[PDB]
Structures are given as structure tokens and as C-alpha cells.
């Protein structure tokens with residue numbers, strides 16, 4: 001239970017230091033990672049309200065031209081199924097996904113937060129069964145953690161995949177590791193609570209996967225930065241393209257990590273730990289594979305719950 005959020009920087013909030021890690025409002029950076037584009041739209045009218053400044057890279061129209069258009073005009077085919085898929089009241093973790101054939105393929109991911117639709121666009125291009133069975137069949141916690149890390153590494157090609165388990169003081173230990181020789185080994189290494197601060201842990205119980213595809217890439221602003229509906233920040237906790245905390249970006253660069261991704265392990269509604277993945281170079285995992293990893297995280301969570309109850 002951290003101290004309350006600071007305002008974000010663009011609303012005059014303080015820049016974060018090691019004295020106040022937990023107060024960074026990481027869910028409302030007003031910016032995205034440059035491997036995709038993000039638009040926000042009115043949930044009733046479909047008016048495009050905010051556009052990431054790099055949108056032309058992915059959509060072929062400048063932000064100023066996109067802004068003010070409706071999703072009916074921009075996405076004729078998707079808008080009705082979108083209108084049908086995401087009416088008011090739904091969980092903000094609920095997703096609509098589609099593939100757009102853009103002259104070559106864009107993955108569209110849409111979620112609703114209150115009266116706003118958040119649209120994420122990024123390039124896209126029988127083994128899940130075997131992964132699920134492997135996790136189900138592990139007869140003890142050690143075996144389960146080994147299978148989880150090995151399976152995730154196999155599926156993703158990440159240089160290093162670890163299982164990070166939280167202690168009651170919110171310090172953590174890496175208790176399983178699958179890696180390329182000789183990525184630095186963190187197996188058995190322990191880390192302070194502040195490295196994964198309490199507002200991050202809280203967010204990670206609500207939105208179960210997040211990533212930084214390129215730890216040296218500059219964030220791309222949303223324009224306008226505030227949602228015109230509310231004159232308030234746009235909630236991006238459920239957007240995988242959300243810019244990552246600069247403090248964490250620096251942590252990763254200092255570790256020689258070019259790309260990072262984690263998946264929550266949730267037991268009894270608490271953050272038990274994280275599947276922590278690193279690559280030394282930048283690395284973008286395809287959207288469909290992210291969905292697979294989320295499924296694997298849920299399965300892992302349920303198996304950890306099961307095996308701990310048996311003890």
C-alpha cells in the first residue's frame with residue numbers, strides 16, 4: 001500500500017528519485033513505445049480524440065489528419081464489431097482483437113476504459129497443448145518452476161527467462177532460470193523491494209503482462225496528452241504499448257538488457273511473483289505469442305496455488 005501517486009510530469013508532478021519510487025504514476029505516462037501506434041476514441045461517437053505522434057508510420061496518415069475522424073470512417077469493418085464487442089461497463093482488461101490488412105499486416109487491440117476506447121496497432125506476422133500439459137503435470141513446485149522457465153524460453157527465444165518469487169517483505173529471489181550460456185546468472189540472487197515498487201506490484205495484479213521492447217527507444221507522446229472528455233490523463237495501465245517508467249528503463253540498460261517482458265503470477269489475489277524475460281538486444285514479441293504467454297501465466301498461477309495448498 002504505497003504513498004499516493006504524484007501527478008504526472010506534464011501536470012507538474014515531481015520527477016522520481018530513489019526516495020519516492022512508489023509514487024510514480026506509471027499507468028498515465030501520456031506516451032507509448034515506438035514499435036506500435038495508439039489512438040483513443042470516444043466510446044459512443046467513435047471520434048478519434050488522441051493520436052500517438054508516430055501514427056503515420058503505421059497508419060499512413062498524419063496525427064492531425066486522424067484526429068477528429070471517426071472510427072466509422074477510419075475502420076469501416078471493425079467499428080461495428082468493435083461497437084458490438086465493447087459497450088460500457090465491461091472489465092477494462094477485456095480485449096477486442098483483429099488483424100488489419102494494410103498495404104503488410106497490423107494487429108489491432110482495443111480495450112475500453114470508462115467512456116474511452118484505447119486502440120493499439122502493431123505489426124503482426126499445437127505447442128500450447130504441450131506447454132499446458134507440462135505445467136499441469138509438474139508434481140512439485142521446483143519442477144513446476146523449471147518447466148515454466150524452460151517452456152517460456154522455448155516459446156519466445158528470450159536470452160534469459162527467470163521466475164522471481166516475492167517474500168512477505170516484498171524482496172524477491174530468482175528461484176528458477178533458463179538462459180543462454182553465458183547470460184549473467186541471477187539464479188539464487190536476491191533483490192530489494194524497491195526494484196519492483198508497490199504501485200507497480202499493484203498494477204501487475206490488474207494487468208498481467210507488460211514489456212519494454214527496446215530499452216533505449218524514446219517514448220512517443222500522445223497528442224493531445226490529456227483526454228478531451230475529462231481534461232485528465234488517459235489511463236494506459238491496460239495498454240501493452242504504454243511507455244515504461246524511465247527509472248526501470250535505466251535499470252534494464254544498466255543490466256545490459258535491450259528488451260524486457262514479464263508476466264504476473266497471481267495467487268489468492270496477491271502478486272506471488274513474476275516470469276521475468278530478458279533479451280540482450282531489442283526484441284519485439286508478436287501479439288499472438290503475448291496472448292499465449294498470458295495463458296501460460298494463468299495456468300502457472302493456478303498450479304502454484306494448487307501445489308502450495310497441498311503443502
Ligand SMILES: *C/C=C1/C(=C/c2[nH]c(/C=C3[NH+]=C(/C=C4\NC(=O)C(C=C)=C4C)C(C)=C\3CCC(=O)O)c(CCC(=O)O)c2C)NC(=O)[C@H]1C
Nearest residue numbers: 017018021026191194195196200244245247248260261262
Ligand atoms: C525508484 C525506482 C526504481 C525502480 C522502479 C520500477 N521498477 C519497475 C518494473 C519492474 N522491475 C522489475 C525488477 C527486476 N527485473 C530483473 O531482472 C530483476 C532482478 C535481476 C529485478 C529485481 C521487473 C521485473 C519489472 C516489471 C517490468 C518488466 O517486466 O520489464 C517499475 C514499473 C515499470 C513499468 O511498468 O512501467 C518501476 C517504476 N526500479 C529500481 O531498482 C528503482 C531505481
